[model samples]
Target: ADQLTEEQIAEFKEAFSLFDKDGDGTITTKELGTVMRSLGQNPTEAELQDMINEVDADGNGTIDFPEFLTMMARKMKDTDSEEEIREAFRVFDKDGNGYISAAELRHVMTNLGEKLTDEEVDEMIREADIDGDGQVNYEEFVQMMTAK
Candidate 1:
């Protein structure tokens, strides 16, 4: 709770707003599934229900922003292993290259409905590319991911 930076909170707030389909301040199971599908993730009905159940700590069957933040905080704090980070890098490394290029980042974000501009993607790569190589190598990706 106290450890989360404002930047992280803001990012999660944006995600919660995106998932809150009805502008209702809470995210229902159906809403999450809908948003996920829109972002090209085909989650099963059971999976959606289970996900809500996992985070809906109040037994309300819906996730309010606080619950959502708690879940996000838990997720961020729990990913301490590089194996999981490597897998996440693989998702962005579409071509199995050892690095994440601007094109791959742009494509993945666009497919996920992020709609980032080419310049935005370049900026992100620049921020993560420690070697100034215009791409994010595994070490750089890990640093970006694990950064607070």
Candidate 2:
């Protein structure tokens, strides 16, 4: 992704490994929250999603090795010297006890301006439902929204 030196690439690969939690090889939104906050920025769930959307060029719904190199390079590009840069899925959970309710999930689809049925909604969320309360969170929500 970014034009990085061999040394820098090696360095970044190490850094990327640090964030590639769950050992999936790509950074998930769950991992993004962990990574961003560690750098001192309070990225809202929406903001986290935006970061990936804007940078994950392949649209794999996650960040791969080369793509992560791009992200590392982008943030560090402006300065050789950089300063600093979430869980609480409440950022997207919005008014639902920091956890989504099954009803809320269905309600969202109904208001989505589509024939999106509850069965469909249930199936989608079920794929990555985090809390398993039949609920979703900022991370899981990002997966669903970007799963398209």
Candidate 3:
């Protein structure tokens, strides 16, 4: 399988930092939910529960950095091509604007069968709009999407 580029590794580390909000080197479901909400997506209760039940390999109701990295690496291994990565990015950037807006993200979430409240959506936009520009550039979108 192709190796992950340095930029991709850096991106993953940054995402790990976000996921490990308390800096404890592990990511709890709550942390995951927070990050997901900031990206305008919310997992169903059942889905969240399932992750806690199934993906927390150490039975700690959390995922450590190594575990998370392993999961991501396996995913990358399954699709070991730049084209796959680019296509994944395209699906996330639904608006086709070369960037992603919170609205576009929310629309994608809705299409995924997740319903979000207006306030939840607004909060996500606020969090992702780091430049206060009311839109998420590719970098920002990538950061949020890849975040734990």
Candidate 4:
């Protein structure tokens, strides 16, 4: 459908070429997962396979350049939501520590309009602090927002 502009098409092709390492003009689960993780996603093996199935046209069970382009377009469209998550994270990352401490979380959450108690805020911090650091790092924040 030629949905992408020239610049978009060029960049998309470059990315596709990187993943289509065999030069066979197609991408399988390995390539897909590699690229996804490089983009900061932690999709499961099954999830990677499902994504391929969703995009693989021609019943090929793999992604060709055209399908990859479509996927790029969709990702570009979703970039806005991704940016919003980053912006939200920055509000609590003011001190440049790049991690949201419980105090920052509680302050931002309360100001942004939650009638949250310290207990509730602490609970949220615990759930997102995967490494038990008692804070939410950028990756953790992104994962939390994206998972929702």
Model 2 agreement with the true structure over 61-122: per-residue lDDT tens digits: 78888788777767676333332113333433557564565566566556657666678877
**Clashes in model 3: which pairs?**
none
- TM-score of the candidate numbered 4? 0.55
TM-score, candidate number 1: 0.46
Positional deviation of residue 88's Cα in model 1 after best superposition, in angstroms: 14
**Considering lDDT, where higher is better, how would the candidates rank from best to worst?**
4, 1, 2, 3
Q: Which residue pairs come into collision in candidate 1? A: none
TM-score winner among the candidates? 4
Of the candidates numbered 1 and 2, which has the greater TM-score value?
A: 2
Each model's lDDT comes to: 0.79, 0.68, 0.68, 0.80
> Which candidate comes out best when scored by lDDT?
4
Of the two candidates 1 and 3, the one with more favorable TM-score, higher being better, is 1
Candidate 2's displacement at residue 53, Å, is 1.1
Note the clash tally of each candidate: 0, 2, 0, 0
Q: Candidate 4 clashing pairs?
A: none
- Model 3: how far residue 38 lies from native, Å: 1.7
Ranking by TM-score: 4, 2, 1, 3
lDDT of candidate 1 at residue 83, scale 0 to 100: 85
